């Protein structure tokens, strides 16, 4: 987050920031393993007075007293009843909101960390850290303890947050293999949506397999994870002047200059500790490792052998998401790997130099992480997921100073005040903050509307279509939803696909659960519901096709209602998914003034066999507004 906000284009001059006051009058709740309050990211230098509306408590507990809160961290609460009820014989070590894991602290800073001068990850990504919304108020709710994590505590945590009057909820947790009426975050999220609170949740990290995502509910903002344009370097310079900018995250200013390099097929595999132990003067020699598909094992073998350094040849996407780099070395691509190997073979006394702690600001960007969970949602296929893409790969955020951060050699663990971490966990809180600010600029916008703005205004390009890191092809809506968040635009979408609490009840109603299962989800925000409707006004489209037999022409009609938040008129531009036709009606929407609503109907005629993408964009005729919605076809897969 020393660069993230710049990457999103947020600034004091114009856009969301100035219009939102950096979210000073807004409150975002974070449900995770707690927080480390004394962190610099949670101090309140440029913070105005706490909004009188707020009345949340600063609940005392172990190493945490009711004075730990301030004008930044305005609330701290924890929930352990599920744990104790499960086993009252348990001695909870940290019986309070204080984070002993880090996940909670990292997320809190990402979403609304205050400006923090001169921080970095062991020299990498140096600068000033700040949340996507530097002046949003933080309300912590710890439901995850070292001793355990219970569903009922999670729900209790959300219910309390919504009750406290929080503006937005950020939760970086997920559960899989369970139906909606057994889905904790979904049940609580439904209640949140019913009361005007938007919930942002991670899609999960079990990608890239199809339908691998969690939190894929219609009443949730499901967030995917993408790479930024940042990279960390161990500049490699050969004895012949050849300079290559490789990848490295060795957490220290190692000194490897004019060191001997060797390329030897007998050990090039870098898998044998015995073999590597045969290289004389291993402490002053750089060994080259071939791409064998298991880089992290090579790094283990290398580190254990205590080599000066190693040049790893690899393009495995996993390498560029990990901060595990306990031994000096560089990772190069296949082409560069051949150059290095050539230099070595054509020389007696081949030498190399590598410097570290270098960070640069990469094309293309962003790119969907290979591990970012994918749709469609096995909790509910009807509505495309995930919803949107946001930075989640190796993000810098606050961290508990007294827990394992990274490693050097095989025996030296290191701690830090700020660490790099990857996953959908990092991405969700980015969306949460952006949503919080949008809510500050428009105090009357609903959760559904705010999500609409964030989606219909998202950027599908990186100026080419955002790629899937796993295959290097165009990313699908099931990969990145509408695309990469674009806060500044989100502020002025022109048209929004709005929805009401009643709309969702109608949707829940159409699922045809038993009245008991229905009540489990409700649960007291609606009764068992005479106008069932599965066509929820959503800023996206998914056309599903069965694969349980012969494939035949299929058709699907979608009904949408777009309200004007800008007098204006739009024309619909269509790009139909592959092997299918689409059409809309009317083809032109005319608005006589603000807040006027207008309805239309999209119709897809497709055949399955494979997820194809298209879109519909309402482009303003006498303006620059462009309302875009993605369209994706998909097989019908096993649902939970």
């Amino acid at each position: 987050t020393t660069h993230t906000s710049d990457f999103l284009k947020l600034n004091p001059s114009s856009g969301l920031w100035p219009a939102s006051g950096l979210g000073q009058d807004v409150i975002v709740a974070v449900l995770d393993s707690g927080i480390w309050p004394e962190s610099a990211s949670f101090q309140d230098d440029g913070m105005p007075e706490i909004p009188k509306r707020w009345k949340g408590i600063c609940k005392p507990g172990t190493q945490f007293n009711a004075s730990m809160c301030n004008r930044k961290l305005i609330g701290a609460n924890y929930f352990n009843k599920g744990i104790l009820a499960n086993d009252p014989t348990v001695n909870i070590t940290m019986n309070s909101a204080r984070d002993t894991d880090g996940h909670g602290t990292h997320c809190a800073s990402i979403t609304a960390g205050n400006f923090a001068k001169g921080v970095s990850h062991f020299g990498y990504a140096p600068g000033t850290a700040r949340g996507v919304a530097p002046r949003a108020r933080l309300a912590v709710y710890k439901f995850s303890f070292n001793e355990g994590t219970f569903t009922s505590d999670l729900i209790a945590a959300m219910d309390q947050a919504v009750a406290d009057g929080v503006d937005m909820i950020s939760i970086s947790y997920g559960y899989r293999f369970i139906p909606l009426y057994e889905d904790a975050i979904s049940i609580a999220s439904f209640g949140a949506m019913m009361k005007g609170v938007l919930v942002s949740a991670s899609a999960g990290n079990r990608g890239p397999g199809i339908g691998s995502l969690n939190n894929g509910s219609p009443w949730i903002l499901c967030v995917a994870s993408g790479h930024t344009d940042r990279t960390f370097a161990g500049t490699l310079t050969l004895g012949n002047g050849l300079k290559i900018r490789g990848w490295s995250l060795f957490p220290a200013r190692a000194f490897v200059r004019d060191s001997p390099v060797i390329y030897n097929k007998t050990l090039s595999d870098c898998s044998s500790e015995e073999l590597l132990s045969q290289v004389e003067n291993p402490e002053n020699t750089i060994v080259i490792c071939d791409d064998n598909g298991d880089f992290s094992d090579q790094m283990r073998i290398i580190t254990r052998a205590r080599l000066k350094a190693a040049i790893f040849i690899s393009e495995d996407p996993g390498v560029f998401r990990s901060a595990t780099f306990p031994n000096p070395g560089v990772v190069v691509n296949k082409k560069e790997g051949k150059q290095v190997i050539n230099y070595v073979k054509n020389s007696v006394t081949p030498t190399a130099t590598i410097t570290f702690q270098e960070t640069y600001l990469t094309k293309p960007a962003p790119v969907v992480a290979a591990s970012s969970a994918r749709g469609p949602s096995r909790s509910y296929l009807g509505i495309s997921k995930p919803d949107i893409l946001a930075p989640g790969v190796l993000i810098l955020a606050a961290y508990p100073p007294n827990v394992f951060a990274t490693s050097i050699g095989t025996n030296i663990l290191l701690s830090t005040d700020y660490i790099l971490e990857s996953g959908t966990s990092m991405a969700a809180p980015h969306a949460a903050g952006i949503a919080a600010m949008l809510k500050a600029a428009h105090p009357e916008w609903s959760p559904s509307a705010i999500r609409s703005a964030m989606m219909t205004t998202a950027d599908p390009l990186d100026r080419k279509p955002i790629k899937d890191s796993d295959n290097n092809k165009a990313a699908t809506p099931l990969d990145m939803g509408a695309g990469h968040v674009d806060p500044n635009r989100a502020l002025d979408p022109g048209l929004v696909y709005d929805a009401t609490p009643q709309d969702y009840v109608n949707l829940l109603c159409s699922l045809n659960f038993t009245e008991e299962q229905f009540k489990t989800i409700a649960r007291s925000s609606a009764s068992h519901c005479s106008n069932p409707s599965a066509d929820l006004n959503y800023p996206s489209f998914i056309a599903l096709y069965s694969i349980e037999g012969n494939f035949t022409l299929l058709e699907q009609k979608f009904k949408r209602t777009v309200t004007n938040v800008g007098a204006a008129t739009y024309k619909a531009k269509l790009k139909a998914p592959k092997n299918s036709t689409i059409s809309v009606s009317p083809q032109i929407l005319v608005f006589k003034n603000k807040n006027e609503k207008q309805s239309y109907t999209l119709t897809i005629r497709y055949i399955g066999d494979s997820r194809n993408v298209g879109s519909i964009t309402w482009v303003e005729q006498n303006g620059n507004h462009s309302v875009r919605s993605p369209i994706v076809t998909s097989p019908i897969i096993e649902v939970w």
């Binding site: 947790y173 559960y175 899989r176 990290n205 996953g423």
Partner: peptide
């Protein structure tokens, strides 16, 4: 369950 899994924290992401």
């Amino acid at each position: 369950f899994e924290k992401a």
